[PDB]
From a paper:
Peroxisome proliferator-activated receptors (PPARs) belong to the nuclear hormone receptor family, which is defined as transcriptional factors that are activated by the binding of ligands to their ligand-binding domains (LBDs). The members of one subgroup, the peroxisome proliferator-activated receptors (PPARα, PPARγ and PPARβ/δ), are the key transcriptional regulators in fatty-acid and glucose metabolism. PPARs are activated by metabolites, such as fatty acids, and synthetic ligands and they regulate gene expression by binding to specific DNA response elements located in the enhancer regions of target genes. All of the PPAR LBDs fold into a three-layered sandwich comprising mainly α-helices, as also observed in the nuclear receptor LBDs.
The PPARα and PPARγ LBDs were complexed with the same pan agonist, TIPP-703, which activates all three PPARs and their crystal structures were determined. The two LBD–ligand complex structures revealed how the pan agonist is adapted to the similar, but significantly different, ligand-binding pockets of the PPARs. TIPP-703 (pan agonist), (S)-2-{3-[(4-adamantan-1-ylbenzoylamino)methyl]-4-propoxybenzyl}butyric acid, has a prominent adamantyl group at the para position of the tail benzene ring and a propoxy group on the central benzene ring. To obtain the high-quality crystal structure of the PPARγ LBD–TIPP-703 complex, a three-week soaking of the ligand into the crystal was required. Even in the best structures determined at 2.4 Å resolution, the propoxy group located at the centre of TIPP-703 in the PPARγ LBD complex was disordered. However, we did not observe any significant electron density corresponding to the propoxy group of TIPP-703, although the ligand molecule was mostly ordered in the crystal with an average B factor of 65.8 Å2. This indicates that the propoxy group interacts weakly with PPARγ in the ligand-binding pocket. On the other hand, the two protomers in the asymmetric unit of the PPARγ LBD–TIPP-703 complex exhibited slightly different conformations at the C-terminus, leading to the loss of several protein–ligand contacts. The overall binding modes of the pan agonist are similar between the two PPARs, but significant differences are observed in the protein–ligand interaction. In the PPARα LBD–TIPP-703 complex, the adamantyl group mainly contacts hydrophobic residues from the H2′ helix (Ile241, Leu247, Ala250 and Val255) and from the β3 strand (Val332 and Ala333) at the entrance of the ligand-binding pocket. In contrast, in the PPARγ LBD complex the same group mainly interacts with Arg280 and Ile281 on the H3 helix.
Numbering used by the authors:
A (entry chain B): 207 to 239, 243 to 264, 274 to 461, 466 to 473
B (entry chain A): 203 to 262, 271 to 476
The structure:
């Protein structure tokens, strides 16, 4: 038993590395110490960032839209990772679609915590770092955008999880048999149970000193959903401003 | 091999179950007994409509107004007593009274409703809910048909209850779970979070051990229980966002102050 669990864990860790360009081991190195990224902290710090950073309206509207693009991009990565989760591509296609539809938002904020610290967040592959203070200073309602997520990251990162821990954790979120619309819950839940097992063992072997880390992590799914519904409400409010057709479509 | 560490956990579990029974009149076992027929002397008077409601009053505000509202006032008062019960239970939690007093308040302020709906599930089944200490049973349809802004206060509850009840938790599981809920460090305002987490940690140790010993054949029941914690939060939020409406549609309807303080700033 412990066998198959280790296997499943290494499997997910590796798939996680293949599907996600910027791991947490890297985001953390960057945030601390080596090719220092371009700190964006000022309006004029931003303009210089537009050029020094690379592979319409005001400015706050351009940053939020910038997050949109990254989101859609990330969604594909998450989708490719998901297919790696043993048993996933065997489920009914409608359910795979459903699980992804309701699971990506929770996964984006989970991984976003990987690129955040109490003072800011890494943007564009980690080339930059827009400070928390600056983001907060964006004219309403855009200065309530990242503040909530920052409070989440502080708490989530306090668990000190690593890529091998998150790899499994992300899978659990995807295999959530509670998504509205599912046609066949049995298989999904069965997989989640098995994933919950792998994550439990992964935590007691990796963080033997962390008492009940497993329990504290599960408790965070609450925070995630708070974040997600709150973010969805922001989108409603916003959906009232400067009102390409193909772009709006892509989102 | 019973270990001395797991010996304390077991002890912690017996302790909490005891205060749970001592603090709450209507346990799940009794509620269960009443609902499933281990009755002849325990059967409730069922309310599934207006005349039935009229007739139920006898054995089961300070005057009268409207149904939907008389029922609402009903629940309001009932929860004032539950808060009192939970507060009584809280104090029994090893370490809860030692905490800062401000945090004591914080914990209860947010914890009271997650626990009420957790326990309210014990008195429900897909078809309705027990009331008046179990002497009565109000059907899901009667409630869901109440006047516009009210015929929607309960539906989400049943929704969660049939799902939650599916885990098949019994009173000795719930006492520990309820303690976990109260001792949650991630509550707004908490001055001292560390002490609150060392306690909750222990409780979770108790619960994980309790569930494995009590439901050996139920795979990952622990984790499945914890996930439910998010359903409660939404139940609460969804709820709060319903009082506000009552607070606008029904201006002549008062609210017990206590409840007005718990809901305040949430
Ligand atoms: C962040 C914060 C939250 C989210 C979640 C998103 C928010 C819509 C979501 O809910 O899906 C995604 C990112 C990811 N976004 C970025 O990493 C990001 C990348 C580039 C920018 C730009 C946008 C403008 C201005 C500036 C220079 C250039 C052009 C890139 C920053 C902003 C954010
Ligand atoms: C239910 C649903 C939600 C809540 C929580 C409430 C929601 C506002 C709360 O936060 O207080 C409590 C109960 C618990 N309610 C009762 O136990 C209850 C008690 C008495 C009555 C009635 C039933 C008949 C007869 C008599 C008057 C009137 C009509 C209400 C007692 C109804 C419910």
């Amino acid at each position: 038993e412990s066998a198959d669990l280790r296997a499943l864990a290494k499997h997910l860790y590796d798939s996680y590395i293949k599907s996600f360009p910027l791991t947490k081991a890297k985001a953390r190195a960057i945030l601390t110490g080596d090719k220092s990224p371009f700190v964006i902290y000022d309006m004029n710090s931003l303009m210089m960032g537009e050029d020094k950073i690379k592979f319409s309206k005001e400015v706050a509207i351009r940053i939020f839209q910038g997050c949109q693009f990254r989101s859609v991009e990330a969604v594909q990565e998450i989708t490719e990772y998901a297919k790696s989760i043993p048993g996933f591509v065997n489920l009914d296609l409608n359910d795979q679609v459903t699980l992804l539809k309701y699971g990506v938002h929770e996964i984006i904020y989970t991984m976003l915590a990987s690129l955040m610290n109490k003072d800011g967040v890494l943007i564009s592959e980690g080339q930059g770092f827009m400070t928390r203070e600056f983001l907060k200073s964006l004219r309403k309602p855009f200065g309530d955008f990242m503040e909530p997520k920052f409070e989440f990251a502080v708490k989530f990162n306090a668990l000190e999880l690593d890529d091998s821990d998150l790899a499994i954790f992300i899978a659990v979120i995807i295999l959530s048999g509670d998504r509205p619309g599912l046609l066949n819950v049995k298989p999904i839940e069965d997989i989640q149970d098995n994933l919950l097992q792998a994550l439990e063992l992964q935590l007691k072997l990796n963080h033997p000193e962390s008492s009940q880390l497993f329990a504290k992590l599960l408790q965070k799914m609450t925070d995630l959903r708070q974040i997600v519904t709150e973010h969805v409400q922001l989108l409603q409010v916003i959906k009232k401003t400067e009102t390409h057709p193909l772009l709006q479509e892509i989102y």
